[PDB]
Design an enzyme around this catalytic site. Structure first.
Site, PDB file in Angstrom:
ATOM      1  N   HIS A 204     -23.921 -25.843 -31.109  1.00 56.93           N
ATOM      2  CA  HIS A 204     -22.858 -25.649 -31.973  1.00 56.93           C
ATOM      3  C   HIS A 204     -22.788 -26.577 -33.002  1.00 56.93           C
ATOM      4  O   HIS A 204     -21.739 -26.410 -34.080  1.00 56.93           O
ATOM      5  CB  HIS A 204     -21.464 -26.336 -30.926  1.00 56.93           C
ATOM      6  CG  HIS A 204     -21.615 -27.666 -30.587  1.00 56.93           C
ATOM      7  ND1 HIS A 204     -21.958 -27.893 -29.139  1.00 56.93           N
ATOM      8  CD2 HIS A 204     -21.414 -28.681 -31.087  1.00 56.93           C
ATOM      9  CE1 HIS A 204     -22.118 -29.279 -29.138  1.00 56.93           C
ATOM     10  NE2 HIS A 204     -21.465 -29.569 -30.377  1.00 56.93           N
TER      11      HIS A 204
ATOM     12  N   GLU B 123     -27.144 -23.937 -25.144  1.00 58.97           N
ATOM     13  CA  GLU B 123     -26.402 -24.958 -25.829  1.00 58.97           C
ATOM     14  C   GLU B 123     -27.295 -25.789 -26.451  1.00 58.97           C
ATOM     15  O   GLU B 123     -26.924 -26.973 -26.861  1.00 58.97           O
ATOM     16  CB  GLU B 123     -25.313 -25.750 -25.239  1.00 58.97           C
ATOM     17  CG  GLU B 123     -24.033 -26.491 -25.907  1.00 58.97           C
ATOM     18  CD  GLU B 123     -23.685 -25.369 -27.117  1.00 58.97           C
ATOM     19  OE1 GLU B 123     -23.607 -24.198 -26.853  1.00 58.97           O
ATOM     20  OE2 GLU B 123     -23.338 -25.809 -28.266  1.00 58.97           O
TER      21      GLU B 123
ATOM     22  N   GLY C 101     -17.722 -36.262 -31.517  1.00 65.12           N
ATOM     23  CA  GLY C 101     -18.658 -37.220 -32.346  1.00 65.12           C
ATOM     24  C   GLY C 101     -19.931 -37.571 -31.660  1.00 65.12           C
ATOM     25  O   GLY C 101     -20.833 -38.164 -32.094  1.00 65.12           O
TER      26      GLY C 101
ATOM     27  N   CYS D 259     -21.825 -35.709 -29.244  1.00 64.03           N
ATOM     28  CA  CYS D 259     -22.777 -34.471 -29.078  1.00 64.03           C
ATOM     29  C   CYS D 259     -24.348 -34.785 -29.818  1.00 64.03           C
ATOM     30  O   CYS D 259     -24.128 -35.321 -30.765  1.00 64.03           O
ATOM     31  CB  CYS D 259     -22.247 -33.167 -29.550  1.00 64.03           C
ATOM     32  SG  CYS D 259     -20.831 -32.584 -28.558  1.00 64.03           S
TER      33      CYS D 259
HETATM   34  C1  LIG Z   1     -19.060 -32.894 -29.311  1.00 69.28           C
HETATM   35  C2  LIG Z   1     -19.194 -32.134 -30.681  1.00 69.28           C
HETATM   36  C3  LIG Z   1     -17.925 -32.413 -31.618  1.00 69.28           C
HETATM   37  O1  LIG Z   1     -17.683 -33.612 -31.571  1.00 69.28           O
HETATM   38  O2  LIG Z   1     -17.098 -31.431 -31.834  1.00 69.28           O
HETATM   39  C4  LIG Z   1     -16.002 -31.575 -32.838  1.00 69.28           C
HETATM   40  C5  LIG Z   1     -15.352 -30.599 -33.620  1.00 69.28           C
HETATM   41  C6  LIG Z   1     -18.170 -32.608 -28.373  1.00 69.28           C
HETATM   42  C7  LIG Z   1     -18.016 -33.755 -27.280  1.00 69.28           C
HETATM   43  C8  LIG Z   1     -16.632 -33.558 -26.688  1.00 69.28           C
HETATM   44  C9  LIG Z   1     -15.376 -33.244 -26.964  1.00 69.28           C
HETATM   45  C10 LIG Z   1     -14.388 -33.887 -26.042  1.00 69.28           C
HETATM   46  N1  LIG Z   1     -15.012 -35.170 -25.291  1.00 69.28           N
HETATM   47  C11 LIG Z   1     -16.544 -34.638 -25.191  1.00 69.28           C
HETATM   48  O3  LIG Z   1     -17.591 -34.897 -24.517  1.00 69.28           O
HETATM   49  N2  LIG Z   1     -18.220 -31.152 -27.868  1.00 69.28           N
HETATM   50  C12 LIG Z   1     -17.405 -30.274 -27.999  1.00 69.28           C
HETATM   51  O4  LIG Z   1     -16.334 -30.289 -28.341  1.00 69.28           O
HETATM   52  C13 LIG Z   1     -17.598 -28.793 -27.660  1.00 69.28           C
HETATM   53  C14 LIG Z   1     -16.678 -27.948 -26.769  1.00 69.28           C
HETATM   54  C15 LIG Z   1     -16.016 -28.881 -25.661  1.00 69.28           C
HETATM   55  O5  LIG Z   1     -16.623 -29.729 -25.304  1.00 69.28           O
HETATM   56  C16 LIG Z   1     -14.740 -28.447 -24.958  1.00 69.28           C
HETATM   57  N3  LIG Z   1     -14.710 -28.804 -23.457  1.00 69.28           N
HETATM   58  C17 LIG Z   1     -14.697 -27.530 -22.374  1.00 69.28           C
HETATM   59  O6  LIG Z   1     -14.620 -26.293 -22.973  1.00 69.28           O
HETATM   60  C18 LIG Z   1     -14.991 -27.788 -21.100  1.00 69.28           C
HETATM   61  C19 LIG Z   1     -14.942 -26.940 -19.998  1.00 69.28           C
HETATM   62  C20 LIG Z   1     -14.976 -27.808 -18.668  1.00 69.28           C
HETATM   63  C21 LIG Z   1     -15.054 -27.140 -17.375  1.00 69.28           C
HETATM   64  O7  LIG Z   1     -15.102 -28.975 -18.980  1.00 69.28           O
HETATM   65  N4  LIG Z   1     -15.052 -29.163 -20.471  1.00 69.28           N
HETATM   66  C22 LIG Z   1     -13.669 -28.950 -25.351  1.00 69.28           C
HETATM   67  C23 LIG Z   1     -13.285 -29.207 -26.753  1.00 69.28           C
HETATM   68  C24 LIG Z   1     -12.408 -28.212 -25.009  1.00 69.28           C
HETATM   69  C25 LIG Z   1     -18.295 -27.944 -28.685  1.00 69.28           C
HETATM   70  C26 LIG Z   1     -18.750 -26.362 -28.510  1.00 69.28           C
HETATM   71  C27 LIG Z   1     -19.658 -26.056 -27.818  1.00 69.28           C
HETATM   72  C28 LIG Z   1     -20.072 -24.742 -27.686  1.00 69.28           C
HETATM   73  C29 LIG Z   1     -19.237 -23.853 -27.967  1.00 69.28           C
HETATM   74  F1  LIG Z   1     -19.606 -22.598 -27.770  1.00 69.28           F
HETATM   75  C30 LIG Z   1     -18.143 -24.092 -28.880  1.00 69.28           C
HETATM   76  C31 LIG Z   1     -17.844 -25.427 -29.095  1.00 69.28           C
END
Ligand SMILES: *[C@@H](CC(=O)OCC)[C@H](C[C@@H]1CCNC1=O)NC(=O)[C@@H](CC(=O)[C@@H](NC(=O)c1cc(C)on1)C(C)C)Cc1ccc(F)cc1
Ligand code: NA
Length: 179
Positions: A37, A68, A142, A144
């Site tokens: 992502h 991913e 932040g 990831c």
């Molecule tokens: C890291 C990247 C980032 O900071 O993006 C900011 C815009 C990030 C870390 C996490 C956010 C919350 N706490 C974390 O560990 N990763 C992301 O934001 C991705 C998407 C998510 O993490 C989502 N989580 C879920 O969908 C989910 C489902 C279940 C059963 O448990 N969690 C939330 C933000 C809703 C980024 C991403 C990855 C892949 C994609 F196709 C789209 C977006």
């Protein structure tokens, strides 16, 4: 720990793409890995240095399901210390993992996430994802790209979370084979 420290100094870089800040693991030679992502595209900034991305491969499983992970080849003459030996051949969980984060905003951060366990299918923001593992730790935006480590092994790359839990893409040494 000496392993985590060595990995931080020698292999884990602060990175920015147009999607924001990410931690990046350099694995060997000019090959590094980012969360899909992050969308590295044609160039990235490594510690503020603009670097051409020569190739970006989005990993998928035998059925084309998202893993991913994006393997990037970086246009640089420096070589990463080869850490393939520390990557398991089979995706493995761990009992007392440390999540290593390294960005401009979260520099040199070691996060004890506790147990890392097989999870499997994850619908990550609407995108079917396989080979994930889970830890009951409140990971945040932040973090990831962060490197999930256990007793001398690199087992995963942080990709997501729902507030209470974090999720990584599991690593297999085979991902990093020379062709
Ligand atoms: C890291 C990247 C980032 O900071 O993006 C900011 C815009 C990030 C870390 C996490 C956010 C919350 N706490 C974390 O560990 N990763 C992301 O934001 C991705 C998407 C998510 O993490 C989502 N989580 C879920 O969908 C989910 C489902 C279940 C059963 O448990 N969690 C939330 C933000 C809703 C980024 C991403 C990855 C892949 C994609 F196709 C789209 C977006
Ligand atoms: Na880019």
């Amino acid at each position: 720990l000496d392993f985590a420290l060595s990995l931080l100094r020698r292999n884990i870089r602060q990175v920015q793409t147009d999607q924001g800040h990410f931690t990046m693991l350099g694995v060997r030679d000019r090959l590094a890995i980012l969360p899909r992502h992050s969308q590295p595209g044609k160039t990235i900034w490594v510690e503020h240095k603009l670097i051409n991305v020569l190739d970006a491969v989005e990993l998928v499983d035998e059925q084309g399901v998202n893993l991913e992970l994006t393997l990037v080849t970086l246009d640089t003459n420096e070589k990463f210390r080869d850490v393939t030996k520390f990557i398991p051949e089979t995706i493995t969980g761990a009992s007392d993992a440390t999540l290593i984060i390294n960005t401009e905003h979260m520099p040199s951060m070691f996060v004890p996430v506790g147990d890392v366990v097989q999870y499997g299918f994850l619908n990550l923001s609407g995108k079917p994802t396989h080979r994930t593992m889970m830890y009951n730790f409140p990971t945040k935006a932040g973090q990831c790209g962060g490197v999930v480590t256990s007793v001398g092994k690199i087992i995963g790359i942080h990709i997501g979370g729902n507030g209470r839990q974090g999720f990584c893409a599991g690593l297999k040494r085979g991902y990093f084979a020379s062709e």
